[PDB]
Amino acid sequence: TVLPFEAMPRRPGNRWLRLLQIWREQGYEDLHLEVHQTFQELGPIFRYDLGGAGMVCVMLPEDVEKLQQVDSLHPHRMSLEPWVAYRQHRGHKCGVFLLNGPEWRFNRLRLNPEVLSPNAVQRFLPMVDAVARDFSQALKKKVLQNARGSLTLDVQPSIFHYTIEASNLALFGERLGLVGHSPSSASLNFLHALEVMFKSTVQLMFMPRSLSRWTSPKVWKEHFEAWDCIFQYGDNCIQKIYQELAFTSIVAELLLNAELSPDAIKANSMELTAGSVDTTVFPLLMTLFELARNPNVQQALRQESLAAAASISEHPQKATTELPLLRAALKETLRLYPVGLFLERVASSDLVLQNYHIPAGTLVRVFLYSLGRNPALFPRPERYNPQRWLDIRGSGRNFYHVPFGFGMRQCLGRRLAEAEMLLLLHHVLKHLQVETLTQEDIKMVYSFILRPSMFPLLTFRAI
Numbered sequence: 001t002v003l004p005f006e007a008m009p010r011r012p013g014n015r016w017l018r019l020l021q022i023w024r025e026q027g028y029e030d031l032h033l034e035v036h037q038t039f040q041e042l043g044p045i046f047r048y049d050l051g052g053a054g055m056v057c058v059m060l061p062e063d064v065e066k067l068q069q070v071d072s073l074h075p076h077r078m079s080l081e082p083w084v085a086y087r088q089h090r091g092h093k094c095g096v097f098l099l100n101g102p103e104w105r106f107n108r109l110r111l112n113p114e115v116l117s118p119n120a121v122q123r124f125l126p127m128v129d130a131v132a133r134d135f136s137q138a139l140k141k142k143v144l145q146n147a148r149g150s151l152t153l154d155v156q157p158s159i160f161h162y163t164i165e166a167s168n169l170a171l172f173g174e175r176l177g178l179v180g181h182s183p184s185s186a187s188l189n190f191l192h193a194l195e196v197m198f199k200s201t202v203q204l205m206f207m208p209r210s211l212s213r214w215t216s217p218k219v220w221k222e223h224f225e226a227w228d229c230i231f232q233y234g235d236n237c238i239q240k241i242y243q244e245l246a247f248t249s250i251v252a253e254l255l256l257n258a259e260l261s262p263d264a265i266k267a268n269s270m271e272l273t274a275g276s277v278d279t280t281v282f283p284l285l286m287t288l289f290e291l292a293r294n295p296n297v298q299q300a301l302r303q304e305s306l307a308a309a310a311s312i313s314e315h316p317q318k319a320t321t322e323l324p325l326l327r328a329a330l331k332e333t334l335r336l337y338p339v340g341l342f343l344e345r346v347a348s349s350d351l352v353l354q355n356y357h358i359p360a361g362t363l364v365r366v367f368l369y370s371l372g373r374n375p376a377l378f379p380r381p382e383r384y385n386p387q388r389w390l391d392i393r394g395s396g397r398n399f400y401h402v403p404f405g406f407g408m409r410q411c412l413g414r415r416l417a418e419a420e421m422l423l424l425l426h427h428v429l430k431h432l433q434v435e436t437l438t439q440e441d442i443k444m445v446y447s448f449i450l451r452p453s454m455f456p457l458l459t460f461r462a463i
């Protein structure tokens with residue numbers, strides 16, 4: 001009863017013209033919408049032919065489960081060519097984000113204890129809480145410096161600085177000063193290189209290195225120069241940490257472990273640094289936006305955080321356990337606005353998705369934008385209702401929330417990202433109320449990650 005792979009519904013359109021249409025623009029900003037529309041038309045599975053190959057698109061938790069069942073010991077995710085190109089050119093190692101096969105697993109097993117283990121989280125969470133406190137106090141100060149105790153501003157830069165500040169402190173044990181009003185020029189240079197590296201990544205990742213090296217030599221120059229600044233900052237930090245180990249951070253533990261070479265430690269530390277760029281910031285912004293649009297949800301989160309403020313202050317780690325509604329609020333935000341638009345696996349072995357045979361080597365992509373909007377799973381999917389997550393009780397409900405991926409290749413920074421998001425929202429919601437003038441949905445664009453095209457100004461008010 002299993003249908004052949006070739007009988008799978010195909011998305012209409014010309015696979016070759018569409019690829020040229022992508023190169024015409026160095027982007028595919030409406031990917032989430034165009035895929036979402038196709039699901040509505042053809043069902044929960046279809047093939048998207050693009051150029052010489054394509055992708056099988058799915059959106060159901062049961063498909064995620066079947067994908068994790070055929071996860072080999074080395075789950076295969078396509079490497080990001082422009083990033084790999086820089087490593088080979090300069091002679092750097094590739095980290096877990098870019099690696100595949102045995103070398104990935106070798107690196108992964110020697111990183112999990114220092115990045116994901118409960119002991120690791122116990123270590124750096126008080127560090128993140130400190131940075132979150134600085135942000136909230138600085139913001140609360142600006143609000144009260146105002147005439148009416150109310151401030152309207154663009155919070156994306158400051159929140160983005162927070163995520164970089166907190167992550168860099170956990171990774172290298174150094175404060176960049178980005179939450180302060182006057183950071184050093186070195187810190188600003190580093191931050192600019194990160195932004196340029198991400199920008200140039202989008203410009204290059206949609207065509208082969210063979211071609212893009214002709215059509216855009218200056219983009220590659222910007223990309224490698226940005227990476228040079230990043231790896232230069234990483235070399236300095238790792239060297240400094242190493243010297244001081246002969247007389248507290250994630251890299252220090254990795255150096256003490258001595259399981260990975262200094263080059264491998266650096267490679268993974270740069271991909272962890274890159275991992276906090278244009279990721280954690282956006283769920284934070286979209287949560288604030290939705291809390292401004294749903295005052296009752298915001299007030300419920302404030303009562304929760306105010307009730308647990310004392311214990312959290314004594315033990316910051318309690319923010320990850322004693323704030324269940326805030327955790328649900330993050331699930332609801334990521335349900336509607338997943339950072340990673342899709343999860344990607346190259347089928348290591350044959351499998352069956354939606355009664356269709358999937359040959360080994362097929363590129364399968366789970367589109368979370370469509371997964372989270374399935375009404376049969378999230379009734380009234382357009383509604384921002386964090387309470388739904390305390391009530392879900394399906395047998396396979398652990399696959400309803402996979403914004404960080406699944407299996408052994410799941411986001412290595414998940415615990416760090418969750419800590420950063422929870423601690424910031426907790427400390428902000430304690431003393432401040434967020435409001436928005438516009439109540440309409442804002443547009444998202446797919447540019448490597450899913451982000452708002454133009455996040456609006458928000459108004460903060462003291463209680």
Ligand code: HEM
Binds near residue numbers: 108167403407410
């Ligand atoms: C809301 C925030 C974030 C989301 C939604 C997110 C999402 C993801 C997803 C979907 C993957 C692919 C997992 C898979 O293929 O199964 C991934 C991988 C990864 N993420 Fe994140 N990420 C976030 C933040 C971060 C942060 C802050 C860091 C580092 C400080 C980070 C580091 C990594 C790394 C190193 C990998 C590669 C893991 C591997 O391939 O073994 N991420 N992330």
Ligand SMILES: N#Cc1ccc([C@@H]2CCCc3cncn32)cc1
Binds near residue numbers: 343411
């Ligand atoms: N598949 C996939 C996939 C898509 C985007 C991302 C993003 C972007 C690159 C670095 C990063 C760290 N954490 C999340 N990300 C990660 C994975």
